[PDB]
Amino acid sequence: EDPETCLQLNMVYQEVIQEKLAEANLLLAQNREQQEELMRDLAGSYMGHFMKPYFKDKVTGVGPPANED
Amino acid sequence: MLSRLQELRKEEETLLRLKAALHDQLNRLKVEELALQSMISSRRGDEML
Amino acid sequence: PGLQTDCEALLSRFQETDSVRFEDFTELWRNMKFGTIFCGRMRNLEKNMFTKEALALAWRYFLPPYTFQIRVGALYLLYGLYNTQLCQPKQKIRVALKDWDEVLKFQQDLVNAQHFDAAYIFRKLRLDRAFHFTAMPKLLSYKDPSDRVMKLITSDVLEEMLNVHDHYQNMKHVISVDKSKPDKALSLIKDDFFDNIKNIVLEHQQWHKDRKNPS
Amino acid sequence: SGIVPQLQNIVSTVNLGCKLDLKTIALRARNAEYNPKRFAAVIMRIREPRTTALIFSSGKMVCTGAKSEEQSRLAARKYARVVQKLGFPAKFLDFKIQNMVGSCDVKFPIRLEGLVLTHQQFSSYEPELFPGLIYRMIKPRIVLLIFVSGKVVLTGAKVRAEIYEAFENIYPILKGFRK
Amino acid sequence: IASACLYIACRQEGVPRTFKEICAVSRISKKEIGRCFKLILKALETSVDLITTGDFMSRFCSNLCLPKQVQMAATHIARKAVELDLVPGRSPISVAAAAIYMASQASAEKRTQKEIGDIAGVADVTIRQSYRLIYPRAPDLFPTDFKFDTPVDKLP
Predict the structure, then answer these.
(1) Contact D93, D145 (CB under 8 A)
(2) How far apart are the C-alpha atoms of B8 and B43, rounded to whole Å?
(3) φ, ψ (nearest 5 deg) of residue E4
(4) Which residues contact D136 (CB under 8 A, 6 or more apart)?
(5) Contact E153 B9 (CB under 8 A)
(6) What does the domain layout of chain D look like in residue ranges?
(7) CATH number of D12-97
(8) Which chain A residues are closer than 8 Å to C168 by Cβ?
(9) Closest CA to C103 of C66, C150, C155, C145
(10) D55 in helix, strand or coil?
(11) How far apart are CA E43 and CA E31, in angstroms?
């Protein structure tokens, strides 16, 4: 008849496939976040480092001076 | 955890394949849209005379 | 120590029934004599530690990424374990916060599917106050899963896809000014989209089976 | 392209014009070292242009580390004044910029294997000896360490124009191998 | 000069060894071997084709007691890994050692990082570093038709 109906139906088909694309890209985002969580697990690391001198230089590794107490 | 890791990556490649298919569909869809705009401009041009 | 094997055994014997009715889980409970998993001499400390482990495991199976059938099975397992304990101050199921919004939508899907057995079981668990509403399970210091592809594509999705496609063709046949042939500017529609997505999902499931088949 | 290499180092030499007693300078200068069991020069450092001068008993000074020609000339004159104040008849003769190490990043990974395969007569790529490809440019006698991360280290030039034209020659070649 | 010529000849014939496999025999350090190797290629005005990962596999997997199946396995893994750019700019010997370690831990005869480091002449730290680069993409590197007794879905 008149391709205006072609426009509108192709637009609603673009709309449904765009909803599908948004859902799929969100699954991609969640899966890539899971991958990055796996990688930060591989790059994760103790409790002895927090023993008696809890604070210590990243250079020398000695605590702060003694308190007055 | 590599069992789960490989399950997740295989799902990832599958969903990337689906996204490739749907993206090709979207591109050809918008090309059809431009074709429709061109032809409707040409055809309404035949009643503004 | 072997407990996860019995949990998996019960969940598998349940999922093989393809049922959701709690009567079937009662039949498996009495058949497996699963309730005697606590029976036997053990002092209070080890007793409640073992109960902690069992409840935490069953709850772990109750959450995603497990199948609906496995999840209802794990809910029944939680009911049966928490209700049959030898600990006098019964151990409580540790519910994280991040999992509460998922367990609630699961309960809603259960009651929407008219699965009133499992929904009533979860209500009974919430009334007996069998939960510790924690921040994270597993105090900190220092199978049968569900796929994304079924959430993407299934029967009804491809059905609506082919409906929209053939309706699109039928309107192509009427948009053209002549009935014999459509316009030469609109012939770019693809017919292999169904075939392409079918190839993708079939390669996926074929790789999945040749994965779960051993060498 | 629009990226130009940043000069990272400039080696220059100068003739002070008088024989020196290095022990005296090492005993009286402010940041000198003199280990004649390790090398045969006085190693002076300064802070203002951040350069290092190796001063030799023949009177020939080697000022390295500057980031520009002018900074290098100023630094060499500074070391000249230093050795002057120490009671030596030092002058400033024959200042010559002997090397310029510039660096740059083309900002795309490179295929070194393809590059050495197609340019076998210039490039040397031994992944066992050095993780970078060594491209001996021939039009200017420059040497480029090209890496898979895209970094390109040009070196061996006496003039900055040589560094620039060498990078301009090498950029299309790398663009051809954009990984 | 003799050691550098030996290395250049081994490379030219198409069975290249590593400098660590010539320094292990000669009386001079790998540094001098490499220096004279470059000097010889400069003097003779000749060149030698670039080594690939499949050259060090018939020897590394045979010096190790691995079967031929594990050997073709590691060959395929390494070739695909250098294909898929999982190991950018890393020496083919370290990639070969990593791929051999993967195919060894996956298959029946397991070998630790230490033995593969001794054979390939690669520090175990490098094996780790270039194994973590191919660690996540393990399955799609392996051969499709590949029997094993340790699930390729679980590897250290």
Answers:
(1) no
(2) 51
(3) -65, -40
(4) D122, D123, D124, D142, D143
(5) no
(6) 1-11+98-179, 12-97
(7) 3.30.310.10
(8) 9-10, 13
(9) C66
(10) strand
(11) 18
Residues C134, C116: Cα–Cα separation, whole Å = 27
Whether D50 contacts D11, CB under 8 Å: no
Q: Please indicate the experimental technique that yielded this structure.
A: cryo-EM
Cα angle E45, E51, E57 (rounded to 5 degrees) comes to 150
* Residues counted in chain D: 179
Q: What token pair was written down for E56?
A: 């060090």
Residue with tokens 């973590």: E132
CATH architecture of E48-155: Orthogonal Bundle (1.10)
Buried/exposed code over E105-133 (b: 16+ C-beta within 10 A; e: otherwise): bbbeeebebebbbebbbbebebbbebbeb
Residue C13 has phi, psi (to 5 degrees) of -60, -25
Q: Using CA of residue C17, residue C23, residue C27, residue C28, what is the dihedral sign?
A: positive
* C87 and C48 Cβ atoms separated by less than 8 Å: yes
How far is A2 from chain C, CA to nearest CA, in Å? 6
CA–CA min distance C200, chain A (Å): 15
Residue of E156, E20, E133, E16 lying closest to E77 (CA atoms):
E133
- Tokens representing residue D22 in the block: 């290095």
**What resolution (Å)?**
3.0
Distance CA C13, CA E98 (A): 43
Give residues with Cβ within 8 angstroms of C44, minimum separation 6: C87
Whether E138 sits inside 8 A of B3 (CB atoms) is: no
SS3 C23: helix
> What is the third-level CATH fold of D1-11+98-179?
TATA-Binding Protein (3.30.310)
Quote the CA–CA distance of D82 and D44 in Å, as a whole number: 10
Alpha-carbon distance of D147 to D152, in angstroms, equals 6
**Cβ neighbours of residue A39 under 8 Å, at least 6 residues apart?**
none
Looking at residue D156, the DSSP 8-state letter turns out to be E
- Interface test mutation site (partner D, options E3, E55, E91, E93, max chain D beta carbons within 10 A): E91
Q: Which residues contact C142 (CB under 8 A, 6 or more apart)?
A: A46, A47
CA C185 – CA C199 distance, rounded (Å): 29
Residues D37, D16: Cα–Cα separation, whole Å: 24
> Is C78 within 8 Å of C59 (Cβ atoms)?
yes
